[PDB]
Write a protein that binds this ligand. Structure first.
Ligand SMILES: [Mg+2]
Ligand SMILES: [Mg+2]
Ligand SMILES: [Mg+2]
Ligand SMILES: [Mg+2]
Ligand SMILES: [Mg+2]
Ligand SMILES: [Mg+2]
Ligand SMILES: [Mg+2]
Ligand SMILES: [Mg+2]
Ligand SMILES: [Mg+2]
Ligand SMILES: [Mg+2]
Ligand SMILES: [Mg+2]
Ligand SMILES: [Mg+2]
Ligand SMILES: [Mg+2]
Ligand SMILES: [Mg+2]
Ligand SMILES: [Mg+2]
Ligand SMILES: [Mg+2]
Lengths: 103, 177, 119, 138, 51, 145, 324
RNA sequence: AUAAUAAUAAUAUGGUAAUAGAACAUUUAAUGAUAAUAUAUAUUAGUUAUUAAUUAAUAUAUGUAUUAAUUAAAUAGAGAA
RNA sequence: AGUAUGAAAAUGAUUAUUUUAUAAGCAAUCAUGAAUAUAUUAUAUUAUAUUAAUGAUGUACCUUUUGUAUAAUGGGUCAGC
């Protein structure tokens, strides 16, 4: 199904705890915050590993098709598109001189 | 003078100037059996050792008091003062009365810019700390100068901000002892 | 004729004592690690040190070879007998295929200085 | 003014009372397998009774499981040592049992030369200070 | 040769803010520089007083 | 030491000796003595009773010292000089004074003598001014209200 | 022949033996005897009393049992008897430990400020330290289910030698860890066990030997290391030292430069002394005159507060904390 | 009058070519319980004086061992062509 | 050149921790600071693991030779044989 990692990998209660923790904490998990569950009087303190922290945050995974090129040729542009915003990277690929940029 | 032990120092059979840290010399040294007096070559800044407690801080009943351990090697005549207060150099004075203290308050609340702490101190022959003690500035004045501090802080760069936090932590570490 | 009042009147004391001539400098509660296996004393037993060389405070010290036992009291408690970490070395020559493995796991005995004071 | 920094005391076994490091030992044997013959005959050779009488502060457990024979010793500090005594006789099993009993459970470690005293106490004679020293340099 | 290019895109409103928080915490945890710092006396004790 | 026990921290801005450590140590010792008293007068079930709590409560000590007329010898600072002294927190001051006496006895004369003193004149049933009597009055008042 | 009836019989028997704690059954518990010998408890402290110390006041189960889906399951313990739990022993141990530790710390350091004294008492007898002492002693918590103990037919002498209380199965499973009161915390239960053991030692020993609860406390608690110097944090020690000298009969403290090297450098060294007349009250070092002055004042204050009197001395009662 | 383990005194323990004892990993044949609360494999961290096995956690497969042990045999051990 | 499975290595890109732009050689061992990670007895003044501050020591391996770091032979690496 088309849904995020937090929605696909967590049980309902753990999802509610995690979402409430992120909401109270500003949008992301923090180690120790007793969270209050809505329409209930019970409180929780979720505990996660850094792998869980990284995997539960929103993200999208894109894969290309079979591209006719070399890794040494792709790296020349993938090292430029390092941590740029996607819109900026799209512009750079639009105005690059390399055949890999279209793909 | 109370104890007449022979005086000795940590000895090395090797050369202390060139082999200060070689432990074999200290190990192989041999002192004659008996009591000795060898002073500690350390500063007593963070110690609570009975041998370092000053006499005035010990109970009179303390037998350790009569004995002359915390040797007064240094003499206060030749050591110059450090960051000393003016009153401590020439003692404190108690000469202002209620009426002029009240008028000091009125001036401070009237024109804090014109009647500053140093100005009042000069006028009335007191200390700026005393001026702050007796008087109190205006809320507008304190607000504007807090805002000035905020502006100065905001104009800082990353390195100066980190350096100031470091200064704060270091100063806090001064007093832990 | 050995006056010891300076060491009597002291809230902290240290002692240098020798086991099999190896010296150890300890204070009340320290943890000594003898690099050998004590077969005379079993775990939980108490050792009375009778080869103390020096007893010292911040500014005074008593030296003896050894010091008289009556003056002081130094007792240790054996807390465990264990071993070092296992190591293996390859002893071999420059153009020899044969390698001989020399394996080492020594023995240690842990002591806790239970009481150190001057009587 | 004075404030306090919260602290917690550090235990010192042997300074007051001594608590024996070894708390429990478990002898696991198998009724099938020649690797457990030594453990079986040790268990039936009137020796475990002597061990219990000699060390009444250790809890001895005897268990059967399919596999190689084991000796499981759990200590006060929370750690645990397991020894497989496969294909050992009564005396060698006893030697392993003595080894487990006669040791603290600390993780085996490598030490440097002359690293034989560990202290929590501050130095009676404070650290050397060049300004406060009997002989001034040059 | 044929290759493939893969990408993982994240959000500035979650990941970057969390990373900034963690970096801030590390900065606050960083120890200060003391001119006469209590640098440990490295080396074994030896069983004798050298001072 | 008696004067130190009868002087509170609020007097002379703590320049002269005062009783805080004595208060704490006496409070702990008296609590232990009252716990053993509840045990003896074996059964570990009377340690949380309202009588047990009131036996050490501050009001009990304040009333005890008032009836024992040790008030005029106590050094402390009246918050508002002319008004009912109840509002001025006198219960705490005098409870502190009594606990200070307990602690001073314990520190100077010893645990055995302190226990004898606390189990004697204090904490008695046939004194009519003892902490026990005051506790019965207080529990009776609580029952009435 | 139903197995449910056999389980009912087992549960009833377990409840009865936990309600009565008979010595005939408790004396067969290897855990209790091993713990007894390990701690060298008095020979007249009954194994039933030790098991009473281990058991906790778990009489009525909570309503959160009805909702395991909400993150809490309690299927490990049986109701206890209101007259055979360890509540009173816990209270008595609290009293004894507080009194003894406070007295010991005071008599060692007569001049400690109240805040530092409280901090040290906590450092010695806090809940965490007591829980660590329990686990170090070997007090182990019952985590298995009564049904599992029935399935493997476990004698009750094994359960009687385990710490028992309403403990939440599912505590941190899947990283949830629903919060609860202290009545469902293992740390508090372990501390309760230690305090109850202290109380039982006293209860059995006071008559013949008034002491030996105090000796046990010195052995297992006051033997622990604690550097009192690491519990201080001053703000304005110059002002505090001036006030202290004024309160005493000492001449005003003036700070003076004793030695200096490396001025006009990254890391200079200044040695300053706070003299009260001709007598040095504090020695400070620093990379700045201000640092050295502060360190000297703090050193003088600490020498004063942490002064330790000899055991042979007439008792020292301090005039109270220096209040400015 | 042995075997195992331990204790004391004494002697000995570098090694190419070479000689002589002992043991371990892999596979196959004979005998051979147990079982998903188990077995096998892999990674990380511990234990046993450690080319090997074992304990814990995690991952995959499997209602499961040519299993522990004793024998008999090898297409039985590779940085060197 | 069967099917299924396949975190086997060599090899490539990226991320994370750590060190690295005044320092020189088989790249490793020991000594020793510092950062980070994990830890349901870290009670801590704790333990372990990873990491080119810094110091000392250190002339790859086989073959064949009286004798080789030798600028004498053989080897790009790994898996299988
Ligand atoms: Mg030299
Ligand atoms: Mg070689
Ligand atoms: Mg050769
Ligand atoms: Mg040979
Ligand atoms: Mg030889
Ligand atoms: Mg072959
Ligand atoms: Mg190969
Ligand atoms: Mg090889
Ligand atoms: Mg080849
Ligand atoms: Mg550089
Ligand atoms: Mg180079
Ligand atoms: Mg030739
Ligand atoms: Mg050569
Ligand atoms: Mg070359
Ligand atoms: Mg070559
Ligand atoms: Mg070639």
């Amino acid at each position: 199904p088309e849904q995020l990692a937090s929605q696909s990998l967590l049980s309902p209660l753990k999802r509610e705890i995690y979402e409430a923790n992120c909401k109270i904490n500003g949008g992301f998990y923090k180690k120790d915050t007793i969270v209050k569950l809505p329409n209930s009087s019970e409180r929780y303190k979720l505990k996660l590993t850094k792998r869980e922290i990284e995997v539960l945050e929103p993200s999208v995974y894109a894969q290309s098709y079979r591209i006719k090129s070399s890794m040494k040729k792709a790296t020349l542009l993938l090292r430029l598109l390092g941590g740029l915003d996607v819109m900026k990277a799209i512009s750079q690929c639009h105005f690059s001189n390399k055949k890999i940029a279209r793909e | 003078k109370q104890f007449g032990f022979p005086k000795t120092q940590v000895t090395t059979i090797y050369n202390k100037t060139k082999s200060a840290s070689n432990y074999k010399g200290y190990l192989k040294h041999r002192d004659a059996p008996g009591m000795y007096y060898q002073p500690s070559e350390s500063i007593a800044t963070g110690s609570v050792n009975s041998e370092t407690i000053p006499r005035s801080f010990m109970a009179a009943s303390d037998p350790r008091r009569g004995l002359d351990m915390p040797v007064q090697s240094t003499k206060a005549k030749q050591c110059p003062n450090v960051l000393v207060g003016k009153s401590t150099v020439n003692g404190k004075t108690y000469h202002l009365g209620p009426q002029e203290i009240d008028e000091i308050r009125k001036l401070r609340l009237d024109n804090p810019q014109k009647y500053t702490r140093k100005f009042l101190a000069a006028k009335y022959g007191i200390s700026p700390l005393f001026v702050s003690m007796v008087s109190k500035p205006s809320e507008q004045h304190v607000q504007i100068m807090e805002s000035r501090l905020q502006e100065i802080q905001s104009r800082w760069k990353e390195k100066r901000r980190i350096a100031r936090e470091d200064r704060k932590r270091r100063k806090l570490l001064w007093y832990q002892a | 004729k050995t006056d010891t009042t300076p060491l009597k009147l002291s809230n902290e004391l240290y002692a240098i004592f020798k086991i099999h001539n190896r010296p150890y400098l300890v204070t009340e509660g320290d943890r000594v690690i003898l690099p050998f296996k004590l077969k005379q004393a079993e775990v939980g037993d108490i050792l009375n040190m009778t080869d103390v060389t020096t007893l010292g405070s911040r500014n005074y010290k008593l030296v003896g070879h050894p010091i008289n036992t009556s003056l002081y009291t130094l007792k240790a408690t054996v807390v465990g007998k264990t071993k070092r970490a296992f190591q293996t070395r390859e002893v071999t020559k420059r153009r020899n295929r044969r390698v001989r493995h020399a394996k080492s796991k020594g023995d240690l005995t842990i002591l806790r200085i239970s009481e150190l004071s001057m009587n | 003014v004075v404030k306090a920094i919260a602290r917690n005391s550090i235990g010192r076994n042997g300074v007051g009372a001594f608590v024996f490091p070894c708390r429990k030992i478990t002898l696991q044997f198998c009724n099938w397998g020649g690797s457990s013959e030594g453990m079986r005959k040790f268990l039936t050779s009137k020796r475990l009774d002597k061990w219990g009488q000699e060390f009444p502060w250790i809890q001895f457990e005897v268990m059967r499981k399919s596999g190689h024979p084991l000796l499981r010793a759990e200590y006060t500090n929370g750690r645990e040592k397991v020894i497989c005594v496969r294909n050992l006789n009564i005396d060698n099993v006893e030697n392993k049992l003595k080894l487990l009993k006669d040791s603290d459970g600390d993780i085996l470690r490598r030490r440097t030369k002359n690293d034989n005293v560990e202290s929590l106490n501050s130095s009676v004679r404070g650290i050397w200070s060049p300004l406060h020293a009997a002989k001034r340099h040059r | 040769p044929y290759i493939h290019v893969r990408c993982i895109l994240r959000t500035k409103s979650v990941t970057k803010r969390r990373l900034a928080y963690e970096a801030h915490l590390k900065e606050q945890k960083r120890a200060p520089w003391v001119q006469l710092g209590d640098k440990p006396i490295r080396g074994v004790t030896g069983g004798v007083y050298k001072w | 030491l008696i004067l130190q026990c009868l002087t509170h921290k609020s007097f002379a801005h703590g320049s002269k000796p005062y009783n805080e450590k004595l208060n704490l140590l006496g409070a702990q010792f008296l609590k232990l003595q009252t716990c053993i008293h509840s045990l003896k007068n074996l059964q570990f079930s009377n340690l949380g009773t309202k009588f047990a709590k009131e036996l050490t409560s501050k009001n009990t000590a304040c009333t005890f010292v008032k009836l024992h007329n040790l008030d005029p010898f106590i050094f402390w600072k009246m918050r508002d000089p002319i008004k009912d002294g109840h509002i001025n927190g006198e219960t705490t001051i005098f409870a502190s004074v009594l606990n200070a006496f307990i602690g001073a006895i314990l520190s100077t004369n010893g645990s055995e003598k302190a226990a004898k003193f606390i189990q004697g004149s204090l904490l008695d049933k046939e004194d009519l001014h003892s902490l026990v009597n005051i506790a019965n009055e207080n529990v009776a008042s609580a029952k009435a209200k | 022949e139903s197995e449910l009836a056999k389980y009912k019989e087992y549960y009833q028997g377990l409840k009865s033996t936990v309600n009565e704690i008979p010595e005939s059954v408790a004396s067969k518990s290897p855990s209790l005897r091993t713990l007894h010998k390990r701690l060298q408890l008095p020979n007249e402290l009954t194994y039933s009393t030790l098991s009473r110390c281990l058991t906790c006041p778990s009489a009525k189960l909570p309503d959160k049992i009805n909702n395991p889906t909400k993150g809490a399951a309690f299927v490990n313990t049986v109701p206890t008897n209101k007259y055979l739990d360890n509540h009173g022993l816990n209270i008595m141990g609290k009293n004894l430990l507080s009194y003894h530790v406070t007295k010991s710390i005071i008599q060692k350091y007569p001049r400690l400020p109240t805040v530092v004294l409280n901090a040290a008492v906590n450092a010695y007898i806090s809940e965490a330290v007591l829980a660590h002492i329990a686990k170090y002693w070997g007090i182990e918590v019952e985590t298995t289910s009564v049904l599992s103990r029935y399935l493997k037919m476990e004698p009750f002498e094994f359960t009687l030698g385990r710490l028992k209380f309403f403990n939440n199965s599912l505590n941190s499973k899947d990283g949830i860890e629903l919060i609860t009161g202290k009545n469902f915390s293992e740390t508090s239960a372990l501390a309760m066990s230690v305090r109850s053991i202290i109380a039982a030692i006293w209860a059995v020993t006071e008559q013949k030997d008034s002491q030996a609860v105090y000796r046990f406390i010195d052995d297992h608690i006051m033997s622990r290391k604690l550097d009192i110097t690491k519990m201080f944090q001053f703000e304005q020690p110059t002002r505090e030292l001036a006030m202290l000298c004024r309160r005493e009969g000492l001449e005003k403290p003036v700070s003076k430069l004793v030695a200096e090297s490396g001025r006009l450098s990254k890391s200079p060294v200044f040695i300053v002394h706070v003299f009260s007349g001709e007598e040095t009250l504090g020695e400070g070092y620093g990379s700045s005159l201000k640092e050295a002055k502060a360190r000297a004042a703090t050193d003088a204050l600490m020498k004063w507060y942490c002064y330790e009197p000899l055991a042979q001395q007439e008792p020292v009662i301090d005039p109270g904390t220096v209040v400015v």
